[PDB]
Antibody, heavy 215, light 218 residues
Framework: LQIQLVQSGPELKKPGETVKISCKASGYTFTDYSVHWVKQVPGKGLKWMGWINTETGEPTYADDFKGRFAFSLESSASTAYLEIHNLKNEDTATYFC??????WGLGTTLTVSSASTKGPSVFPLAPSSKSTSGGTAALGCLVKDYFPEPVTVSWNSGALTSGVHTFPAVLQSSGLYSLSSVVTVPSSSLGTQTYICNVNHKPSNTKVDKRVEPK | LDIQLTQSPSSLAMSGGQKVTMRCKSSQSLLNSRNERNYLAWYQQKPGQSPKLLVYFASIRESGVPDRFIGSGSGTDFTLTISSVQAEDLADYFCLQHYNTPWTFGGGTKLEIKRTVAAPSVFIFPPSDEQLKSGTASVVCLLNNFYPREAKVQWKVDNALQSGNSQESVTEQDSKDSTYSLSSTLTLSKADYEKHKVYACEVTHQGLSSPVTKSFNR
């Protein structure tokens, strides 16, 4: 069996609010391993927050996390929870549940900000005689004016991955983010192949599919 | 006080096939006299992923981990070696002590891959009709699959060098060919965009014999 720790999705919260993040365990005996929580700040530094005993439900907190943090579990659902109350700017981070040192979950990205959520506008980057290098053409999608991070982009529902480049977002003076995703393909094939970018911004339930074709 | 883990070096650039040595020094001994085990683990965190266990109890390689990864050391001084580094080994590496609570982590070592010069392919993209309707024009210039990262991108509009209206973004290194890609985006109001005809990005890079310009006409 493959150990799986599925965590809840990216969230944006305002200062002072409460958030509850889940870690659902499958592929192993839940009561066999304690569940630890680790905070990774955007800078990538890691901080161990404490752990919860899955047999008894008893949590233990690291000193820095005694106050606004609560670990709990739901036995019947093999699920561990991290609840943070009175959220502060410094709580912005990715939070991992982990089976001690053995296995990390995929993490939950939390942003704490007074700014409103904003879904992206998605525009085609259309191939042409000037996005043509040798017999290679480039095309893509511009994903503009969203908040907060992150946003996911795929091509042809995951079927197109070769040569795909999805750029780190830039911060605009407006406080909104923007990025592009591009791909290179044969220029000879632009009339017969179909290229769709799939953009998902979970913090705003925005999903868009944009077909990209020569202008 | 808490056990402190010092990782060195904090960044390493190595070419494929070189031996990589990363160090983790603990303020306090991680050797459990009760177990003769060293309570240190090494992780690899590749771009955009969660940490993966490479080595546990200092020297025991995790199942599935390539044998080029070797953990060693004891007490206060530990080492993770990659006998022959591969392109896909591009990652942040960090150590974890779980000898005593609170568990603590090293600061990490970022492993970057050195490779031969690779020239960028350059492409330019006009703004879409949909966006212009909206009141803005984003013009994107793409530099694809190049090395090293050092590159100069200049925007010229009707032959006039632009300043102050563009932003660049560079990708993480590619895990297969160790190259970078870069985007430069020029953003104008629709009004300003329609004031000019020729939009060009000029790219300077050591893989190019001289600067390459890509352009279109509005």
């Amino acid at each position: 069996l493959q150990i799986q720790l599925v965590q809840s999705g990216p969230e944006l919260k305002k200062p002072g609010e409460t958030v509850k993040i889940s870690c659902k365990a499958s592929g192993y005996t839940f009561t066999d391993y304690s569940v630890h929580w680790v905070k990774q700040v955007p800078g990538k530094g890691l901080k161990w927050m404490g752990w919860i005993n899955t047999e008894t439900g008893e949590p233990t907190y690291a000193d820095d996390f005694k106050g606004r943090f609560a670990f709990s579990l739901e036995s019947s659902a093999s699920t561990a929870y991290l609840e943070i109350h009175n959220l502060k700017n410094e709580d912005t981070a990715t939070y991992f549940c982990a089976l001690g040192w053995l296995h990390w979950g995929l993490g939950t990205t939390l942003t704490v900000s007074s700014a409103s959520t904003k879904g992206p506008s998605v525009f085609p980057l259309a191939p042409s005689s000037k996005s043509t290098s040798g017999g290679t053409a480039a095309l893509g999608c511009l994903v503009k004016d969203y908040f907060p991070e992150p946003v996911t982009v795929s091509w042809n529902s995951g079927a197109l991955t070769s040569g795909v480049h999805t750029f780190p977002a830039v911060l605009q003076s407006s406080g909104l983010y923007s990025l592009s995703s591009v791909v290179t393909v044969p220029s000879s094939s632009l009339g017969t192949q179909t290229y769709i970018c799939n953009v998902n911004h979970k913090p705003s339930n925005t999903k868009v599919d944009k077909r990209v074709e020569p202008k | 006080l808490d056990i402190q883990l010092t990782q060195s070096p904090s960044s390493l650039a190595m070419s494929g096939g070189q031996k990589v040595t990363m160090r983790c020094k603990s303020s306090q001994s991680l050797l459990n006299s009760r177990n003769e085990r060293n309570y240190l683990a090494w992780y690899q965190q590749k771009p955009g992923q969660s940490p993966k266990l490479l080595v546990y109890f200092a020297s025991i390689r995790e199942s599935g981990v390539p044998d080029r990864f070797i953990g060693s050391g004891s007490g206060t001084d530990f080492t993770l070696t990659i006998s022959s580094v591969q392109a896909e080994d591009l990652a942040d590496y960090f150590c974890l002590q779980h000898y005593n609570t609170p568990w603590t982590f090293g600061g990490g070592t970022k492993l970057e891959i050195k490779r031969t010069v690779a020239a960028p392919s350059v492409f330019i993209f006009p703004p879409s009709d949909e966006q212009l309707k909206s009141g803005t024009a984003s013009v994107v210039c793409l530099l694809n699959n190049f090395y090293p990262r050092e590159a100069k991108v200049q925007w010229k509009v009707d032959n006039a060098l632009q300043s102050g209206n563009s932003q660049e973004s560079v990708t993480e290194q590619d895990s297969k060919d160790s190259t970078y890609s870069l985007s430069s985006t020029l953003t104008l109001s629709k009004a300003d965009y329609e004031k000019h005809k020729v939009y060009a990005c000029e790219v300077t890079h050591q893989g190019l014999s001289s600067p390459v310009t890509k352009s279109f006409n509005r």
